[PDB]
Amino acid sequence: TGYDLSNSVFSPDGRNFQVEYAVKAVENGTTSIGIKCNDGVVFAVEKLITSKLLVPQKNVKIQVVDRHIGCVYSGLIPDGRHLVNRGREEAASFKKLYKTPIPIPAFADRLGQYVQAHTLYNSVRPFGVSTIFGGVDKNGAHLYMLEPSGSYWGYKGAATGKGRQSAKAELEKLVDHHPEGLSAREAVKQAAKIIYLAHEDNKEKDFELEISWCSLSETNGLHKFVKGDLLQEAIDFAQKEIN
Amino acid sequence: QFNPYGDNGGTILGIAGEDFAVLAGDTRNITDYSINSRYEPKVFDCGDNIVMSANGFAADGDALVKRFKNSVKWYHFDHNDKKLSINSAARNIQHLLYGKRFFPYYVHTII
Amino acid sequence: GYDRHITIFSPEGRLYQVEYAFKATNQTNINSLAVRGKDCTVVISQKKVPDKLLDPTTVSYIFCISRTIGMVVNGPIPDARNAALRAKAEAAEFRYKYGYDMPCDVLAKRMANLSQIYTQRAYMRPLGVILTFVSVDEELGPSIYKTDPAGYYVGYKATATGPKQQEITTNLENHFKKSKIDHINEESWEKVVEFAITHMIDALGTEFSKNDLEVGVATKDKFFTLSAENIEERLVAIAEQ
Amino acid sequence: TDRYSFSLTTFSPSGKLGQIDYALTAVKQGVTSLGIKATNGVVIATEKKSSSPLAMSETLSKVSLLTPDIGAVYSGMGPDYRVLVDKSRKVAHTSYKRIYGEYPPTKLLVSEVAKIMQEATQSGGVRPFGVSLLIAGHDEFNGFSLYQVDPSGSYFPWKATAIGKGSVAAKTFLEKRWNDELELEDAIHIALLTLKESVEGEFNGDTIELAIIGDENPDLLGYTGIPTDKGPRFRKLTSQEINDRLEAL
Amino acid sequence: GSRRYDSRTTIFSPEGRLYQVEYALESISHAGTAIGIMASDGIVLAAERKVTSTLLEQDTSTEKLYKLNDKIAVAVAGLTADAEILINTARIHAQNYLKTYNEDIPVEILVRRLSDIKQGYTQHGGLRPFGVSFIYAGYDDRYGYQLYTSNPSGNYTGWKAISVGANTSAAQTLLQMDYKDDMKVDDAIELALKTLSKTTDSSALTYDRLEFATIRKGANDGEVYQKIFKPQEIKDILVKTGIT
Amino acid sequence: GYDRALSIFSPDGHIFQVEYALEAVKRGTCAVGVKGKNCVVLGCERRSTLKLQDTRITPSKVSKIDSHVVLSFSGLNADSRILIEKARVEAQSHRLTLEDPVTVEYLTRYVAGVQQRYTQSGGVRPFGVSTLIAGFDPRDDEPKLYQTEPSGIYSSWSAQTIGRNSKTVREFLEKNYDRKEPPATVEECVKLTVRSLLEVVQTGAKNIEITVVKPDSDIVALSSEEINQYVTQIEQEKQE
Amino acid sequence: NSHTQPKATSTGATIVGVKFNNGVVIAADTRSTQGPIVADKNCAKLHRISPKIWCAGAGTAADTEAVTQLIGSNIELHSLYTSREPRVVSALQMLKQHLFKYQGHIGAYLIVAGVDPTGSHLFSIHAHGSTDVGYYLSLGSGSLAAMAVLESHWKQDLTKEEAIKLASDAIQAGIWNDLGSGSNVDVCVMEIGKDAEYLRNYLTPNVREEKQKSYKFPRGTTAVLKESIVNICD
Amino acid sequence: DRGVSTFSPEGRLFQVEYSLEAIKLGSTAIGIATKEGVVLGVEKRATSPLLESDSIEKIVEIDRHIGCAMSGLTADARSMIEHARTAAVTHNLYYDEDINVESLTQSVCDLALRFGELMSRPFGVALLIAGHDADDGYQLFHAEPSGTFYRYNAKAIGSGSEGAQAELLNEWHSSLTLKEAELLVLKILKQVMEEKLDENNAQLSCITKQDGFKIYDNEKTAELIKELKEKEAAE
Amino acid sequence: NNYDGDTVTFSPTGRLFQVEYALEAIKQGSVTVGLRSNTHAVLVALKRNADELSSYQKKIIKCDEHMGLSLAGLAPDARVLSNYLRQQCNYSSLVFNRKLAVERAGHLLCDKAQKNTQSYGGRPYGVGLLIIGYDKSGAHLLEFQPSGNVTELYGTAIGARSQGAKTYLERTLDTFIKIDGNPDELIKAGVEAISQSLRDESLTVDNLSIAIVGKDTPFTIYDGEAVAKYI
């Protein structure tokens, strides 16, 4: 055998074992989710408080691309940052040439092609992150999830990390119970709950909640962080549901 | 055709005493027959008890001073915070200026 | 046995990485089919959306390469999209350089030559995909040309690709034995799509709803994909006969 | 970025070049193709092994025109052959026609193709080509000629030969039938006889591909006016033309 | 990365040998024998074609003997394809020298440069060496008639009579026995053929399985002529020496 | 470009590729260098398994780098040509910029520098060659003899030998060569060099090459008969 | 890039192109000039890009021949690659992009004309890389003399024989009235569904009259210093 | 095989650790720093008696105020010395002054880790860099192929290093004179050397503010050897 | 085992062993402590020596007038990274006339370290860093690891036996955070913190190394007799 030692090598199955091994690194990471709503998207993430010595609110994991796209990821944090840095260059050159801000589907492929390129050669390592991202463009709201292989699809709801199955189950219920749609402010509250419910799969260390959102009405189509009263309101809603 | 140099006027003056030294310079900045500023300093403290002024084309003057100030900073990093002597600073400035021998800084420098 | 890891010959004159790239083709477990009419070329493919959280509109293995050319892929979506982007670029560059729209067969050859390079050069792996190009060419008429990881390509009267490809192939073979002709003798593209779906149902032995299928149609001067409602309308017509 | 800057083909302790030998083994598996040289022409022929009956075998051309007076056929890996034909056509222009204002003679074009195949035997990060070519052609000063080209880059001129699946038997058949007084029509007849032995299934103009290097064809030129330009000596026989010769077989 | 698949062609063995060079020489030992004999008034080059087929075109063929310029020729032993790469380089180098100095290149200078190219492939680049051994036969106004040989190591040496390829051990013994310094071209022709006739792996030595060439001063007054023998000319010289 | 680090360290602190290059030198034909009071003599072995050779045109074992310096070697023959070429070029370059020919120490230092560079450069193997460089500096009558090796180290020697069976001939020179009183004349220096080779060679016919270098660019190679006279003289004195 | 060569041949010319019923015809004169001197009295200005695409050239003689051959070479390779007969728009696009890249320093002014699966086509290309479409076009130093005739006599729905007459009449106007043009009239007819017919020296209205005297010298007239046989053989 | 810039499970670079073993095989070199100067001394170690020992150059001048002694694969040190000399002279050109001993050592140590897959392997030689400047006075540095350098009051490198270092631990004090330091190097060298110590197989050198860097003659060192033997027999 | 030859290879459980072996080099390194209040930030570092005749390896490096770090692991790798930080701080000043934010400093280091863990040929950095600084948003303390992970903290410690000092700071969190406008008391808290990581050895005059930055205090390093106050 030895088919799993090098990247870009097909096994007799037709599989790239190195990419599958990168997925294990993603499964090891903290939980992160994405929720598509009426006129936008909501992102949320689990931040494990390793120590009292960590400064609260000052280790931000969710990243903005351009002014209208939000990105969150689970797995190797540095790999995610590298991916977002590329995303920003891709979005910058699009706007430079075509004037309009990059559409979300267009942006999704730019990342997809870049991640896929890292499964083509043995001189590079696959990305150790699944990335949930999206925003608002001319055609409305979009949510995407991108994997180490380069595979991505559009999503109504998306989840990845150690508590992905718990989060996926909770997301599937929202899609069933709200066929006509979910509002932006509601999605923020639900996002908090799902992170708290997904924390049951990582309950040794207590955690810190972090939420962001894009909405045509609430944020004027731009990416913003959820802070202050609106954040505490979402935490209280989540606290009430677990008990 | 584009001319990359300009004359910002002004004048500077250095005198050395026994245990001291002065470096003076007027604060007027001009182009042609117009006044740009009545107070635009061009004599700078560069650290290590070195004062510098690069009079002539102000853009090149600012660029040079900026680069020498930075040279002093990296001299400290690379040589254990050693004080840059005035004679060493002078030689360092020669290399800055001659570095652009074929597209010069149009300035008369005094430290 | 490092001769199985990179694209160099084995003692029996084989390229194992190329052979394993063929097995990656069926990793999605999707079957595709392509047929030609008088004025058109129709391509159909199964659509499987297992996860409830997926946005089904974004789940697609059919691509619009140029205005005239369409492409369906059998294989993983990352490699599929890699191939699609390159084909789009090549088709656009061809038009700019040579002053006319790139033919379906010429694009197929170009993508096949690119695939061949990955089988000979070591640092590049083959793509685990089979690309089926379709159009109504202005010189050659209705056209179907298919490319694989080996760098092989050829034109087709009709074709099929996927896990249950052989069952679909013989189903089509038996039809053309009977009809005695190279195509589907039918005026409108609507009925050529109905033929394609009907014969896939017979071969695979499964029934299809509007969301179980994905359809692409090539006519003169444009290629387009059908919506769920366009397919539903098409499924009704089959049931009422 | 390509970091395979080293040879993937090397000498083994016994003195064998493994990858070349294995490439020749790939050629052995390939479908039979042959070439016969006559006094007033050359014939090259092969079987069109169809991958599927739904596939249009007309679109896949195993016999290719390289220059108006030179043609080529192969046995082995089809994709490798295709790109060699592309490179062979281009090199005929860049390294000859754009210099001398005329098409290269058979031996020199063959030499350029061999050089390309030799480099794939020694250059970094590549395998040899998995094909053997037969190149038939004509030029003013050398007349008619037939060459074989192997994965190693070696080439040999032949009166007649065969390569691929049933080459051992086919070469024996040609030794009995070949003489130095053969006319072109006689060589086509022998080619069809030789090929029937190796072919198993259907044997007709649709399953057989055959081209000749013979007299000039003014009708195939496309224009008139210039007396010196008399047309291509390469001609691909049609499906109908083959079937006519199969009746009086 | 790619390190995993590197053969490391340009390294030493524990014994201080170059693996790839030694294995390339092993390859060459299976190639058709080629002999060079230097006489006082000319040079002979004889070479045995590799197992000929009856349907091979013999008259319009070139496998063993190649012309580098008007005064220099080479006999090949090993991979023909590899030899042609080196031959075209040697042909160009000879024309560069003529262009620069307006004089035909001295034989040794051409040999050294061609041997230096082979050396390069054993010391750097990570590529396999050229699986070829040459016998150089040429003339210049400094040293007169000269025979050299080069091999994949890039080492070259001068000879009075030498063989390369198959059965060199047996061939060199026979040459050492019958060769003498005051020899003529016509005698050297007879020695070359007799040696091949005994060392050959074939049943009998025939015209269609040979390549032959001479470099004489047999032209009119103080000038050198290269003769690459035709099939019929080999047939005649084979009968004239009483081999067939 | 081919980048692979071929020369690297091993757990025990050795660079095997450099050490295996020394084995190639040990395989090569013997070479000896002996320096007298007013001269240096370079002796070289030629193996006698090669008959039917053409000694006119066969590359000589001793090479002139400039009119006043010579270089002999042991090991791979093809490798030695590359070092000699580089050295000859550097010799002309030195005359061009310094307006003075190279010293023997400088030329040695340059050749040794090249050899070293090939021990820590990517994509290359070390030179399988050790050299003996000898001659006289410009306007100087003091004899110079240096040695180099694949690793890159170089040093000066009163007398030295390299190649196959070099440890035997080094043993001979160690007791026969006196530091306080070196060979006073050319004849004495040549005789000691021939004597030392006769411990190893086999026969004193066309197996031994001798080259004598004297001050002010005075270099000459001895013929067969001239060398044979030394062989005949030594053997008659031996029978005692 | 070198800003012109005066030594470089740059012939005066009259080349034209006329569209008709079932195809297109091009024509040209046959004078090549060096300054005021007539270098070639019967050169061929009609070039073949492909079998059924032909190209008339004016301006810098070396640039028109070189650019037409290069594109013709690449068109042949393109035709073999695509298994299709080459199109006029492909030659047009490849020519203009080449010429534009060199910013006019390649002084090639061309009338391109031919037939292909799309139909019959007629274009003109200027040295700087601009292209024009038309039913009738003229270039060269005698373009104004030719265009005057074309503007006077051209109509829609010309027959084959009418187009040849109009084209050659336009070239004749250049021959007589323009000093840069002269000698003969070449023509090439490209009809749809037929082979293109090249009519070298279609008209020869400028034949040299009999000389008044023969200037054959008595043998031995020229004084000689040395004779010697030259060796061409090996 | 395996990468050149690879880490071991313990957290060390394989190649750097292996180069250190090569340095242990090398000949001994000792350095001692005092307020009156810095002394450098080496074991020459001729492989044969025919080798002219005066051509063994294991002590080297970098500038007038900086000297250098080496141990290990001494051929590797040539490019390090070349770099050091250029760095020293270049700094004088740019700043019209002598360059600090520490800054010089840092410049040399920057080359050390510039290897991988830049040069193909680390250096197989350790350097003792001794010098003087106005700021920090007399200094002695030990520069390894790991890119690390320590300042030392006294230091021994080479085959007899661990035995010599233990001896330097006891003998060194802050009030050592230059003459005392010279004898101390000779004393310790004679203890760890295989062959018997003399002026031909051992070399001394020093650097002082006044006279700069000086390699001692064989006549001068011979007297110091004789002075050393007499003093040990005197008690 | 089979998946630790180079950095480009993942293990079956999704681990990068070459990165983990680089992390191991930090644990072997000497202890260093970082902590901050609202007004000031402090670095305390235990320097290590080869023997009694050698000097003590300098652990703290200055990057700008308002920023600097302490190191633990491969010192040459710290020199490379600190040099990169010096340039980035300097680029921010020359181009934007702007002092580089401590958070951006961390982001830049993260991205530099990451590139070395995804490409063939190269290797991960073998050093951990503690960056302190004072910018427009007050005092800051960062912890850099060569995996790429950078973390902002009130206090922390890295190196051998760093768990002792880290536990102390976790207990003392509420006390030392409010030491505002008092440098000497914040240092005292740091010196007491590093003392929880000592075994057999104690803090001497040429062993201890302290650095501080704050509101009206440029980044300055204290060594030798200047740290005798805190023993």
Ligand SMILES: [Cl-]
């Ligand atoms: Cl292509």
